[PDB]
């Protein structure tokens, strides 16, 4: 048990599509800031906590499945829900947390410390800390700007360095003090623009599915990624005004290295897409979705790749990633976007280890 | 027991927010077409079937709750799911129907006849049959045009008389033969434009919530219904092209009387809204939303009207209904919109009683 020799906490990412339990061990430096953070246990379950019926039977079963086979107990737990919970009013969220609090009070293996919904701005701060902790860019002053994107199921986050600015909402700026260095970040989360929520606006768009895919309305797919991308861009920009919010800020505060986490790592690592060095460009992502999925015959393609439950969505998702990054954020189609390998189980929860405060 | 002397079937509306069981008795005319349709049992449950975990324990608890206390069971059952289920790919929908079929086979009473997902176009035909059945406009040729809107949680339907147009998809037209008359209808369903799915694009729009309502992002509501409406219109028209699809048809095929079912009946019948004769105008809907919700201080208003779970959403919903009907469908803001009183339990299921065929 590493936790007899190191500090350990458990942090649960209660995401829109599923929850991920992590147990982390760590030591601390002379200011009591964590270092040597190691994941010693992981467990993921589906579906999203905020999608299940909020009654005792259902919540008991879900929590029991998530937690019950961990090799290490008697450790503090931080349960933090994200955009799936944010879709619900406080009073519905309350049903979940009252039931959760009760389940923890009824047992003795886990010590619940916090269980609450964090804002997309909190989540975006944690997204940047987690990635930059793994890149070891936190201990010393960097001479390059690292931006992070988290491609979630219900919201997407963007976060990048930006000097403190009297003209931008205080909620979209964070002054972070860590390892003796002062870091100022712009943060934004776009609720409804995560892959599940976005997709619900395009399921009858023939351009967004392979040829002959059966759309729910009875029409047929007729895929064309640039056309699908244009439809998604309408939601990005005509509805959410992503471009007007984010592009002027990126123009003034350029990002040298972009890192992405969330669903895009899984798409880019699938059998259908081909990228080297765990990185992509939006130009290649759109090309590959267009020709590998959109313009293919659905039943033939589905028969060739039977084991991928996301296959039917790849025309829409490649198009959507491009719409978000290129037409929303203004990122050049030729710019490299690194993505963290899925095997790494990297989500924003490392950020909670390093930084316990919330908005 | 009515069912000893009259034909009875059970029809379940498995909607996105809940399921409604109806047992209908009826007689038939000389062509075996139902007449004297009466609801003899109703039970409603939440949440929507396509929201719950598709496992044996969860599905059996949900079906038991919906069906077990029905006071007549040896009758044919039709279980028809709508837009909630259409958000999921066929492979996920199959997990639900496989479990549901198994549950029916573990009892000997209900004769399950069909359990399947119907298209939005089927649903729109049944919406028009159900309302016109109640208005007694089916047995004779009408000299006026009756249009129906169903304001659902995941999709909205619109349906109205229109002669065959060879330039419009076959999927959006139905040639209906009922009571010896031939009726040609235009049908359309807009997936993702139902109240629940729409709302997930505007939860951090301050214009769509009462003053100081706590938005999930940490910002404050600052309601203004015209402004909220314009945001929703961008989703109606810039994204879904509702205007371009519907207005040219209604221009050439005007509707004389509009009837609505779905959530708008509940909103219009609430304590916050004031309408006479079970009818509204969009101009009065928007003005009442603006003044009675959008421009009120949230804590004050919430304290005044504690018993209404939808109150927080009424600035958004009033603006949304106006965006859909006026800016999307092109209906004049002073045109009367009849809504069916909620206590009538009217949904599209009476259409299934009348017309068993699907597309
Ligand atoms: N092959 C894939 N393509 C796109 N998105 C994916 C894929 N696999 C998983 N996701 C999404 O990736 C996120 C993280 O998934 P997981 O680590 O499996 O919970 C969720 O939003 C999933 O819906
Ligand atoms: N007061 C209300 N305002 C707006 N929508 C409502 C209200 N009450 C119920 N609904 C919606 O009306 C539809 C039918 O509700 P029910 O008859 O309660 O299943 C669902 O989409 C509900 O979410
Ligand atoms: Cl549909
Ligand atoms: Cl948020
Ligand atoms: Mg996430
Ligand atoms: Mg059979
Ligand atoms: Mg419905």
XYZ file of C-alpha atoms and ligand atoms in Angstrom:
769
model
C 0.000 0.000 0.000
C 1.779 3.139 -1.282
C -0.512 5.282 0.864
C 1.308 4.146 4.071
C 4.332 6.051 2.738
C 2.795 8.812 0.544
C -0.195 11.102 0.610
C -3.143 9.670 -1.309
C -6.494 11.054 -2.390
C -9.203 9.700 -4.652
C -10.730 12.050 -7.248
C -13.749 11.113 -9.309
C -14.335 12.792 -12.655
C -18.135 12.558 -12.918
C -18.256 13.328 -16.671
C -21.285 13.474 -18.977
C -20.633 10.025 -20.517
C -19.184 8.178 -17.504
C -17.347 8.491 -14.179
C -13.611 7.807 -13.674
C -12.257 7.069 -10.250
C -8.548 7.771 -9.749
C -6.457 7.089 -6.672
C -3.320 9.214 -6.722
C -0.266 8.928 -4.500
C 2.090 11.891 -4.188
C 4.705 13.550 -2.094
C 4.993 17.276 -1.407
C 7.683 19.817 -1.759
C 8.683 22.450 0.827
C 5.517 24.496 0.351
C 3.412 21.311 0.685
C 2.664 21.367 -3.124
C 2.256 17.922 -4.633
C 5.041 16.333 -6.665
C 5.628 12.724 -7.905
C 1.864 12.335 -8.601
C 1.222 8.705 -9.600
C -2.071 7.069 -10.476
C -2.247 3.840 -8.423
C -5.804 2.849 -9.303
C -8.284 3.674 -12.051
C -11.886 2.513 -12.598
C -14.288 3.823 -15.189
C -17.982 3.163 -15.514
C -20.760 4.332 -17.775
C -23.168 6.033 -18.232
C -22.889 9.608 -16.832
C -23.982 10.026 -13.171
C -26.299 12.895 -14.193
C -28.106 10.671 -16.702
C -29.306 7.937 -14.272
C -32.541 8.017 -12.201
C -31.755 9.968 -9.002
C -33.218 7.443 -6.512
C -31.453 5.407 -3.801
C -31.512 2.057 -5.568
C -30.001 3.398 -8.775
C -27.438 5.729 -7.131
C -26.359 2.895 -4.636
C -25.800 0.470 -7.507
C -23.779 3.078 -9.508
C -21.545 4.139 -6.633
C -21.043 0.572 -5.515
C -19.885 -0.441 -9.056
C -17.534 2.564 -9.346
C -15.864 2.091 -5.948
C -16.297 -1.379 -4.571
C -13.165 -3.321 -5.925
C -10.418 -0.720 -5.247
C -7.187 -2.202 -3.749
C -6.846 0.705 -1.268
C -9.301 2.194 1.134
C -9.495 4.649 4.057
C -8.671 7.582 1.817
C -10.303 10.905 1.179
C -12.646 11.248 -1.838
C -13.378 14.319 -3.975
C -16.341 13.731 -6.280
C -16.603 16.481 -8.866
C -19.268 16.529 -11.547
C -18.974 18.450 -14.769
C -21.165 19.446 -17.755
C -23.676 16.562 -17.572
C -24.673 17.782 -14.081
C -24.581 21.428 -15.268
C -27.413 20.682 -17.676
C -29.716 20.194 -14.583
C -31.156 22.907 -12.291
C -29.773 23.055 -8.699
C -32.892 21.431 -7.300
C -32.438 18.236 -9.445
C -28.728 18.152 -8.783
C -29.660 18.252 -5.050
C -31.453 14.872 -5.381
C -28.258 13.278 -6.626
C -25.937 14.804 -4.001
C -28.282 14.102 -1.084
C -28.400 10.432 -2.161
C -24.659 10.290 -2.767
C -23.884 11.900 0.619
C -26.110 9.341 2.300
C -24.453 6.368 0.531
C -21.023 7.590 1.727
C -22.310 8.134 5.297
C -23.549 4.491 5.251
C -20.067 2.963 4.698
C -16.567 2.922 6.127
C -14.037 2.211 3.281
C -14.051 5.828 1.848
C -13.976 9.281 3.496
C -16.020 11.681 1.418
C -14.524 15.185 1.621
C -16.396 17.067 -1.216
C -19.112 16.136 -3.679
C -20.284 18.952 -5.904
C -20.644 20.281 -9.425
C -17.695 22.390 -10.527
C -18.164 25.204 -13.127
C -16.754 24.871 -16.704
C -14.211 27.567 -15.705
C -12.978 25.471 -12.754
C -12.875 22.426 -15.053
C -10.865 24.406 -17.701
C -8.322 25.458 -14.999
C -7.963 21.830 -13.977
C -7.686 20.764 -17.653
C -4.642 23.119 -18.069
C -3.001 22.066 -14.802
C -3.393 18.381 -15.553
C -1.789 18.572 -19.016
C 0.962 20.957 -17.942
C 1.761 18.825 -14.893
C 2.284 15.836 -17.263
C 4.446 18.016 -19.622
C 6.479 19.242 -16.520
C 5.932 22.831 -17.493
C 4.728 23.946 -14.039
C 7.937 24.040 -11.933
C 9.786 26.588 -14.099
C 8.848 29.706 -16.123
C 8.121 28.580 -19.715
C 9.203 30.514 -22.769
C 6.355 29.059 -24.859
C 2.547 29.376 -24.492
C 0.771 26.037 -24.002
C -2.944 25.933 -24.791
C -5.249 23.123 -23.743
C -8.530 21.920 -25.153
C -10.771 19.349 -23.470
C -13.222 17.790 -25.973
C -15.914 16.523 -23.561
C -19.331 15.013 -24.114
C -21.463 17.967 -22.940
C -19.081 20.925 -22.844
C -15.713 21.780 -24.427
C -13.047 23.783 -22.588
C -10.276 26.024 -23.967
C -7.601 27.507 -21.731
C -4.386 29.380 -22.528
C -2.095 31.948 -20.987
C -3.382 35.528 -20.957
C -2.274 38.549 -18.873
C -4.923 39.794 -16.460
C -7.317 42.038 -18.427
C -9.803 44.565 -16.922
C -12.078 44.193 -19.954
C -12.768 40.380 -19.760
C -15.196 38.770 -17.206
C -13.480 37.782 -13.979
C -15.062 34.338 -14.368
C -12.963 33.788 -17.570
C -9.645 34.670 -15.979
C -7.651 32.779 -13.369
C -4.542 33.889 -11.553
C -2.779 30.717 -10.602
C 0.050 30.536 -8.059
C 1.986 27.268 -8.259
C 5.533 26.116 -7.476
C 6.365 29.770 -6.778
C 5.317 31.026 -10.174
C 2.387 33.233 -11.017
C 0.370 32.116 -14.016
C -2.496 34.028 -15.571
C -4.909 32.059 -17.720
C -7.944 32.733 -19.879
C -10.578 29.976 -19.377
C -13.819 29.252 -21.184
C -16.204 26.356 -21.310
C -18.974 26.067 -23.933
C -21.970 24.191 -22.541
C -23.969 22.265 -25.211
C -20.938 22.124 -27.554
C -19.648 18.753 -26.199
C -19.876 15.909 -28.674
C -23.184 14.286 -27.373
C -25.088 17.541 -26.982
C -23.807 18.981 -30.336
C -24.634 15.796 -32.196
C -28.325 16.017 -31.187
C -28.650 19.038 -33.548
C -27.326 17.125 -36.664
C -28.666 13.583 -36.622
C -30.837 14.233 -39.703
C -28.107 15.956 -41.672
C -27.203 13.731 -44.665
C -23.867 15.548 -45.057
C -22.761 14.299 -41.605
C -23.095 10.586 -42.198
C -21.726 7.940 -44.564
C -23.590 7.325 -47.840
C -26.803 5.360 -47.199
C -26.511 5.536 -43.406
C -30.160 5.312 -42.148
C -30.901 8.717 -40.602
C -33.627 8.612 -37.887
C -36.092 10.605 -40.157
C -35.917 7.952 -42.850
C -33.636 9.786 -45.196
C -30.178 8.486 -46.282
C -26.692 9.705 -45.408
C -24.820 11.485 -48.196
C -21.620 12.388 -46.436
C -19.384 15.385 -47.256
C -17.159 16.552 -44.406
C -16.719 20.192 -45.579
C -20.521 20.478 -45.861
C -21.081 18.848 -42.407
C -18.405 21.200 -40.989
C -20.271 24.239 -42.383
C -23.471 23.117 -40.606
C -21.617 22.614 -37.303
C -19.945 26.000 -37.724
C -23.440 27.606 -37.731
C -23.967 26.230 -34.223
C -20.420 27.286 -33.156
C -20.687 30.830 -34.500
C -24.179 31.903 -35.369
C -25.547 30.471 -32.080
C -22.621 30.350 -29.561
C -20.425 33.079 -31.148
C -17.313 31.052 -30.341
C -15.286 32.922 -33.030
C -16.131 36.416 -31.738
C -15.284 35.381 -28.121
C -12.102 33.373 -28.643
C -10.365 34.587 -31.868
C -9.544 38.199 -30.748
C -7.936 36.740 -27.595
C -5.822 34.155 -29.471
C -4.716 36.908 -31.916
C -3.316 38.940 -28.949
C -2.094 35.918 -26.922
C -0.812 33.325 -29.417
C -0.438 29.699 -28.374
C 2.754 27.941 -29.345
C 1.797 24.343 -28.522
C -1.808 23.006 -28.477
C -2.707 19.902 -26.437
C -6.121 18.210 -26.532
C -7.749 15.669 -24.225
C -11.218 14.058 -24.275
C -12.891 12.299 -27.165
C -10.559 13.490 -29.916
C -7.769 11.223 -28.503
C -10.010 8.235 -28.942
C -11.081 9.174 -32.484
C -7.537 9.943 -33.555
C -6.291 6.563 -32.094
C -9.034 4.475 -33.675
C -8.590 1.986 -36.479
C -10.255 4.405 -38.927
C -7.816 7.339 -38.567
C -4.043 7.347 -39.051
C -1.792 9.782 -37.169
C 1.834 9.573 -36.072
C 3.446 10.935 -32.902
C 0.091 11.310 -31.107
C -0.635 14.496 -33.004
C -2.831 15.673 -35.810
C -3.663 18.676 -37.971
C -7.210 19.859 -38.614
C -6.539 19.740 -42.354
C -5.626 16.007 -42.183
C -8.444 15.200 -39.669
C -11.091 16.677 -42.039
C -9.548 14.998 -45.166
C -9.455 11.620 -43.391
C -13.068 11.886 -42.123
C -14.217 12.990 -45.536
C -12.643 10.180 -47.507
C -12.372 7.363 -44.936
C -16.009 7.750 -43.637
C -18.241 10.451 -45.225
C -17.876 9.282 -48.827
C -17.969 5.589 -48.060
C -20.971 3.277 -48.391
C -22.327 2.755 -44.881
C -23.132 -0.985 -44.888
C -19.817 -1.833 -46.577
C -17.801 0.321 -44.102
C -19.746 -0.915 -41.094
C -19.109 -4.560 -42.197
C -15.327 -3.790 -42.577
C -15.029 -2.213 -39.088
C -17.508 -4.044 -36.844
C -15.959 -3.368 -33.521
C -16.123 0.402 -33.157
C -19.289 1.844 -31.609
C -18.275 5.365 -32.649
C -17.798 4.442 -36.344
C -21.187 5.792 -37.380
C -20.326 9.193 -35.912
C -16.849 9.669 -37.411
C -17.981 11.784 -40.371
C -19.857 14.110 -38.015
C -17.108 14.154 -35.322
C -14.173 14.845 -37.602
C -16.225 17.639 -39.213
C -17.201 18.965 -35.788
C -13.632 19.022 -34.380
C -12.573 21.026 -37.430
C -15.512 23.421 -37.084
C -14.752 23.975 -33.421
C -10.941 24.397 -33.718
C -10.648 26.116 -37.109
C -13.861 28.065 -37.536
C -14.580 28.595 -33.820
C -11.156 29.061 -32.172
C -9.439 30.307 -35.398
C -6.631 27.697 -35.233
C -4.872 27.297 -38.614
C -5.743 24.017 -40.423
C -2.007 23.276 -40.741
C -1.162 23.740 -37.055
C -0.166 20.601 -35.085
C -2.622 19.580 -32.318
C -1.075 17.087 -29.876
C -3.499 14.709 -28.195
C -2.772 12.722 -25.133
C -2.767 8.926 -25.736
C -6.018 7.405 -24.338
C -4.074 4.660 -22.527
C -2.781 7.406 -20.167
C -6.176 7.968 -18.525
C -5.447 11.659 -18.380
C -8.375 13.890 -17.408
C -8.519 17.160 -15.449
C -8.448 15.355 -12.044
C -4.600 15.794 -11.670
C -5.502 19.474 -11.436
C -7.555 18.795 -8.263
C -4.524 17.078 -6.699
C -2.420 20.254 -7.301
C -5.084 22.905 -6.609
C -7.952 22.348 -4.246
C -9.724 25.730 -4.601
C -12.772 26.327 -6.793
C -14.481 29.537 -8.002
C -65.313 -3.888 -17.767
C -65.776 -1.830 -21.032
C -63.483 -4.221 -22.874
C -65.974 -7.084 -22.723
C -68.317 -5.151 -24.983
C -65.989 -2.754 -26.926
C -62.612 -3.111 -28.609
C -59.703 -2.121 -26.328
C -56.021 -1.619 -27.035
C -53.220 -0.122 -24.894
C -50.918 2.394 -26.531
C -47.803 3.702 -24.789
C -46.337 7.119 -25.813
C -42.681 6.505 -24.814
C -41.723 10.221 -25.041
C -38.429 11.820 -24.317
C -39.449 13.099 -20.828
C -41.726 10.215 -19.705
C -44.004 7.452 -20.811
C -47.844 7.544 -20.953
C -49.913 4.414 -20.932
C -53.395 4.740 -22.308
C -56.041 2.092 -22.521
C -58.649 3.106 -25.131
C -62.061 1.536 -25.724
C -63.790 2.143 -28.999
C -66.434 0.805 -31.382
C -66.092 0.616 -35.147
C -68.111 1.863 -38.096
C -69.097 -0.148 -41.205
C -65.543 -0.110 -42.517
C -64.060 -1.238 -39.154
C -62.692 2.268 -38.509
C -62.757 3.265 -34.783
C -65.451 5.650 -33.441
C -66.446 6.544 -29.816
C -62.793 6.352 -28.705
C -62.609 6.798 -24.890
C -59.603 6.645 -22.613
C -60.511 4.254 -19.762
C -57.058 4.200 -18.099
C -54.012 6.478 -18.031
C -50.743 6.196 -16.213
C -47.716 8.422 -16.652
C -44.211 7.893 -15.380
C -40.888 9.779 -15.647
C -38.221 9.909 -16.841
C -38.126 8.995 -20.548
C -37.495 5.311 -21.347
C -34.503 6.181 -23.619
C -32.853 8.023 -20.630
C -32.620 5.098 -18.213
C -29.887 2.467 -18.023
C -30.766 -0.291 -20.530
C -30.198 -3.158 -18.116
C -32.590 -5.829 -16.938
C -33.094 -4.467 -13.381
C -33.769 -0.885 -14.484
C -36.049 -1.727 -17.446
C -38.075 -4.247 -15.424
C -38.625 -1.670 -12.563
C -39.709 0.972 -15.137
C -42.124 -1.350 -17.042
C -43.571 -2.682 -13.761
C -44.199 0.837 -12.539
C -45.879 1.864 -15.815
C -48.023 -1.244 -16.316
C -48.484 -3.497 -13.373
C -51.479 -1.687 -11.689
C -53.450 -1.267 -14.992
C -56.937 -2.530 -14.314
C -57.249 -4.604 -17.600
C -54.182 -6.506 -18.984
C -55.464 -9.198 -21.382
C -55.388 -6.630 -24.214
C -53.066 -5.858 -27.136
C -50.203 -3.425 -26.319
C -48.474 -1.026 -28.750
C -45.339 0.527 -27.330
C -44.118 3.376 -29.567
C -41.052 5.442 -28.727
C -40.367 8.876 -30.182
C -37.557 11.445 -30.347
C -35.765 10.385 -27.132
C -35.155 6.969 -28.646
C -34.311 8.493 -32.089
C -31.290 10.239 -30.484
C -29.687 6.784 -30.054
C -28.202 4.563 -32.787
C -30.142 1.361 -33.665
C -27.608 -0.824 -31.756
C -28.389 0.996 -28.477
C -32.138 1.058 -29.166
C -31.975 -2.765 -29.625
C -30.738 -3.242 -26.005
C -33.907 -1.519 -24.825
C -36.348 -3.473 -27.093
C -34.616 -6.824 -26.379
C -35.081 -6.285 -22.610
C -38.601 -4.947 -23.079
C -39.556 -7.954 -25.251
C -38.112 -10.306 -22.595
C -40.084 -8.512 -19.817
C -43.402 -8.952 -21.760
C -42.605 -12.645 -22.352
C -42.258 -13.222 -18.564
C -45.966 -12.432 -18.160
C -49.012 -14.098 -19.956
C -51.583 -11.327 -20.041
C -50.538 -8.263 -22.090
C -50.426 -9.329 -25.706
C -47.455 -7.190 -26.807
C -48.169 -6.506 -30.488
C -45.420 -4.007 -31.380
C -42.599 -2.214 -29.569
C -40.578 0.028 -31.790
C -39.338 3.502 -32.502
C -41.587 5.472 -34.838
C -40.187 8.210 -37.153
C -40.904 11.900 -36.522
C -42.973 11.832 -39.729
C -45.166 8.942 -38.408
C -45.428 10.840 -35.108
C -46.477 14.084 -36.957
C -49.249 12.083 -38.849
C -50.498 10.681 -35.496
C -50.362 14.233 -33.935
C -52.674 15.488 -36.716
C -55.057 12.513 -36.458
C -55.306 12.766 -32.640
C -56.175 16.487 -32.563
C -58.545 16.302 -35.562
C -60.226 13.227 -34.073
C -61.011 15.277 -30.959
C -62.202 18.225 -33.052
C -64.474 15.808 -35.035
C -63.055 17.055 -38.317
C -62.208 13.606 -39.810
C -65.589 12.134 -40.757
C -66.480 14.936 -43.238
C -64.599 17.063 -45.784
C -63.506 20.316 -44.148
C -63.663 23.727 -45.793
C -60.901 24.971 -43.511
C -57.282 23.972 -43.016
C -56.305 22.724 -39.526
C -52.616 22.704 -38.654
C -51.160 20.883 -35.640
C -47.917 21.494 -33.736
C -46.621 19.033 -31.107
C -44.121 20.800 -28.822
C -42.176 17.794 -27.488
C -39.073 17.444 -25.285
C -36.627 16.204 -28.035
C -38.368 16.987 -31.299
C -41.139 19.275 -32.488
C -43.602 18.256 -35.173
C -45.626 20.401 -37.603
C -48.348 18.979 -39.859
C -50.929 20.590 -42.136
C -52.925 19.916 -45.314
C -50.969 20.172 -48.538
C -51.661 18.736 -51.992
C -49.013 16.253 -53.318
C -45.855 18.100 -54.386
C -43.450 16.006 -56.442
C -40.591 18.360 -55.566
C -40.862 17.611 -51.850
C -39.443 14.414 -50.279
C -41.928 11.536 -50.130
C -41.002 11.296 -46.391
C -42.564 14.687 -45.657
C -45.907 13.820 -47.314
C -48.679 11.483 -46.431
C -51.788 10.532 -48.289
C -54.261 9.705 -45.592
C -57.483 7.819 -46.167
C -59.784 8.086 -43.146
C -63.554 7.623 -42.919
C -63.775 7.455 -46.750
C -62.065 10.824 -47.293
C -58.672 11.351 -48.829
C -56.409 13.903 -47.078
C -52.915 14.901 -48.211
C -50.671 16.208 -45.433
C -47.251 17.749 -45.119
C -45.385 16.369 -42.095
C -42.089 17.413 -40.571
C -40.288 16.703 -37.310
C -37.258 18.687 -36.148
C -34.977 16.501 -34.018
C -33.041 18.459 -31.421
C -35.556 21.342 -31.418
C -37.710 19.853 -28.607
C -37.604 21.841 -25.325
C -35.014 19.728 -23.459
C -32.516 19.371 -26.337
C -32.928 23.076 -27.427
C -32.405 24.344 -23.891
C -28.956 22.670 -23.625
C -27.648 25.281 -26.156
C -28.744 28.334 -24.017
C -28.152 27.527 -20.336
C -25.451 30.188 -20.051
C -27.411 32.875 -21.973
C -28.197 35.604 -19.428
C -30.959 36.959 -21.728
C -32.884 33.661 -21.303
C -33.150 33.644 -17.452
C -34.615 35.871 -14.738
C -32.380 38.569 -13.271
C -29.754 37.015 -10.954
C -30.706 33.429 -11.789
C -27.441 31.477 -11.135
C -26.287 30.268 -14.557
C -24.187 27.060 -14.476
C -21.017 29.026 -15.568
C -21.277 31.342 -12.590
C -22.691 34.334 -14.433
C -26.047 35.926 -13.582
C -29.299 35.891 -15.510
C -30.330 39.205 -17.039
C -33.498 38.326 -18.831
C -34.776 40.001 -22.034
C -37.201 37.872 -23.998
C -36.680 39.588 -27.433
C -32.958 39.003 -27.029
C -33.357 35.399 -25.894
C -35.750 34.841 -28.798
C -33.169 36.119 -31.335
C -30.635 33.587 -29.903
C -33.119 30.731 -30.289
C -34.020 31.916 -33.802
C -30.344 31.471 -34.815
C -30.685 27.767 -33.866
C -34.085 27.510 -35.690
C -32.950 29.164 -38.905
C -29.157 29.503 -39.237
C -28.733 25.898 -38.035
C -31.911 23.975 -38.863
C -33.271 26.156 -41.725
C -36.764 25.857 -40.290
C -37.815 29.128 -42.042
C -36.599 28.057 -45.475
C -38.293 24.621 -45.238
C -41.662 25.617 -43.738
C -42.557 29.208 -44.695
C -42.786 28.764 -48.467
C -45.164 25.795 -47.919
C -47.405 27.635 -45.491
C -47.485 30.655 -47.819
C -49.059 28.585 -50.573
C -51.104 26.321 -48.242
C -52.370 28.538 -45.451
C -53.584 27.182 -42.212
C -56.926 28.578 -40.940
C -56.761 27.176 -37.392
C -53.639 26.198 -35.416
C -53.746 23.677 -32.618
C -50.854 22.797 -30.346
C -50.126 19.938 -27.932
C -47.069 19.140 -25.800
C -45.318 21.351 -23.267
C -46.854 24.656 -24.455
C -50.256 23.561 -22.970
C -48.608 23.168 -19.569
C -46.788 26.504 -19.741
C -49.901 28.338 -20.915
C -52.033 26.702 -18.111
C -49.482 27.467 -15.398
C -49.971 29.947 -12.551
C -47.517 32.402 -14.227
C -49.295 32.801 -17.560
C -52.759 34.129 -18.185
C -54.746 32.968 -21.212
C -58.471 32.656 -21.833
C -60.366 30.061 -23.901
C -57.368 27.631 -24.018
C -55.686 29.766 -26.680
C -52.796 32.148 -26.950
C -51.054 34.525 -29.348
C -47.276 34.493 -29.724
C -47.209 38.286 -29.092
C -48.897 37.849 -25.699
C -46.750 34.776 -24.841
C -43.546 36.746 -25.428
C -44.735 39.846 -23.601
C -45.923 37.837 -20.547
C -42.650 35.850 -20.484
C -40.659 39.115 -20.712
C -42.548 40.895 -17.966
C -43.541 38.140 -15.603
C -40.269 36.150 -15.686
C -37.308 37.584 -17.699
C -37.286 41.004 -15.968
C -38.105 39.726 -12.451
C -35.470 39.133 -9.731
C -35.060 35.390 -9.564
C -35.034 34.856 -5.732
C -38.114 37.065 -5.370
C -40.047 35.310 -8.142
C -38.997 31.835 -6.991
C -40.217 32.693 -3.501
C -43.545 33.976 -4.878
C -44.190 30.796 -6.977
C -42.567 27.910 -5.086
C -44.490 25.028 -6.513
C -43.552 25.102 -10.203
C -40.497 23.071 -11.351
C -40.560 24.786 -14.729
C -40.585 28.374 -13.444
C -36.852 28.868 -13.924
C -37.179 28.041 -17.595
C -40.168 30.183 -18.474
C -38.202 33.190 -19.851
C -36.367 30.704 -22.140
C -39.488 28.691 -23.083
C -41.730 31.640 -23.905
C -38.909 33.101 -26.091
C -38.334 29.639 -27.680
C -41.971 29.051 -28.601
C -42.103 32.504 -30.239
C -38.811 31.847 -32.102
C -40.141 28.521 -33.382
C -43.644 29.628 -34.369
C -43.058 33.181 -35.533
C -39.452 33.235 -36.828
C -39.313 29.541 -37.817
C -42.773 28.668 -39.134
C -43.644 32.252 -40.103
C -46.971 32.339 -38.107
C -48.156 35.905 -37.441
C -47.562 36.929 -33.813
C -51.288 37.853 -33.462
C -52.635 34.618 -34.933
C -54.565 32.543 -32.350
C -52.885 29.288 -31.323
C -55.294 26.915 -29.650
C -53.728 24.531 -27.111
C -55.387 21.436 -25.799
C -55.976 21.604 -22.000
C -53.401 19.361 -20.235
C -56.032 17.556 -18.182
C -57.316 15.969 -21.410
C -54.175 13.790 -21.557
C -54.142 14.241 -25.312
C -51.063 12.981 -27.160
C -50.581 11.428 -30.620
C -51.628 7.921 -29.385
C -55.283 8.374 -30.539
C -53.766 8.475 -34.076
C -52.440 4.915 -33.581
C -55.964 3.788 -32.559
C -57.265 5.189 -35.883
C -54.419 4.259 -38.201
C -52.163 1.271 -37.481
C -49.738 1.680 -40.459
C -46.258 3.227 -40.166
C -43.881 4.461 -42.938
N -13.652 6.377 -30.722
C -14.120 7.520 -30.166
N -14.312 8.634 -30.934
C -14.796 9.799 -30.425
N -15.144 9.978 -29.140
C -14.936 8.922 -28.266
C -14.411 7.618 -28.740
N -14.290 6.801 -27.656
C -14.740 7.517 -26.591
N -15.130 8.756 -26.971
C -15.545 9.830 -26.076
O -14.360 10.079 -25.279
C -14.736 10.525 -23.966
C -13.934 9.732 -22.946
O -14.281 8.360 -23.039
P -13.885 7.243 -21.940
O -12.424 7.481 -21.545
O -14.147 5.929 -22.639
O -14.957 7.584 -20.877
C -16.257 10.396 -23.914
O -16.925 11.689 -24.232
C -16.533 9.422 -25.037
O -17.853 9.592 -25.532
N -45.218 23.987 -16.845
C -44.577 23.537 -17.972
N -43.958 24.359 -18.883
C -43.378 23.887 -19.999
N -43.252 22.576 -20.316
C -43.840 21.652 -19.490
C -44.500 22.099 -18.245
N -44.977 20.969 -17.622
C -44.669 19.912 -18.409
N -43.961 20.320 -19.506
C -43.453 19.498 -20.611
O -44.666 19.001 -21.214
C -44.459 17.713 -21.815
C -45.575 16.753 -21.367
O -45.501 16.642 -19.937
P -46.238 15.469 -19.068
O -47.665 15.506 -19.575
O -46.046 15.948 -17.651
O -45.371 14.260 -19.511
C -42.999 17.332 -21.421
O -42.083 17.669 -22.509
C -42.731 18.220 -20.216
O -41.330 18.404 -19.988
Cl -36.581 11.967 -36.905
Cl -20.461 26.237 -17.406
Mg -14.873 15.380 -19.210
Mg -45.627 -10.586 -32.538
Mg -44.151 13.626 -27.237
